[PDB]
């Protein structure tokens, strides 16, 4: 039908997870740097 509002939010969660993981470790890499 019209506009997959659910699956968008699904890959939104995934996008937000990937970022926190990636940014979170980039911040830790720099403290140990």
């Amino acid at each position: 039908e019209e506009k997959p509002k659910g699956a968008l939010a699904v890959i939104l969660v995934l996008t937000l997870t990937i970022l926190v993981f990636w940014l979170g470790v980039y911040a830790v890499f720099f403290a140990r740097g």
Partner: protein
């Protein structure tokens, strides 16, 4: 319904793939940043440097552990570190803060890890190879080396110590 959701679905699919290729790009540029700055020292040096492991604590800088800390520049010391059967040589490693400490590590037995707790120094130590990593300890105090590779039964007990002077 249905027939309608194949038109709309190849649109969102494309747009999501398009987004992702830039999200990943923005990582690649940031991975590159760390490669250009000073922090890139912890990456092992490429050029092979083989040794004889059985004859390493007799012949070569890994023999006399008092000679481990050797000045090799105006503000750069090299430390010849040995990763053996459940210990590290020397114990401890005394080095000055603010200086470029160039570690050179090898093994007379099996594969061990060199994980200096609180630093980015995490380098695999291989029998017959000289792992060359670079770090500048900014802050004085005691640091602790954990071995992070299964090296036999004593593995869990295999720790080292690095003292950075004041």
């Amino acid at each position: 319904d249905q027939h309608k959701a194949h038109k709309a679905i190849l649109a969102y699919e494309k747009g999501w793939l398009a987004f992702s290729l830039a999200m990943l790009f923005v990582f690649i540029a940031l991975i590159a940043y760390t490669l250009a700055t000073h922090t890139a020292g912890v990456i092992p040096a490429g050029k092979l440097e083989r040794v004889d492991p059985t004859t390493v604590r007799q012949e070569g800088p890994w023999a006399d552990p008092a000679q481990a800390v050797v000045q090799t520049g105006p503000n750069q010391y090299t430390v010849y570190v040995l990763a053996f059967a459940f210990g590290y040589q020397p114990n401890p490693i005394e080095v000055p803060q603010g200086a470029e400490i160039v570690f050179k590590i090898t093994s007379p037995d099996v594969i061990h890890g060199f994980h200096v707790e609180g630093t980015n120094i995490n380098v695999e130590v291989l029998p017959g190879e000289v792992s060359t990593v670079r770090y500048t300890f900014k802050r004085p105090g005691e640091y602790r080396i954990i071995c992070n590779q299964y090296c036999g039964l004593g593995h869990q007990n295999m720790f080292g110590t690095i003292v950075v002077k004041e």
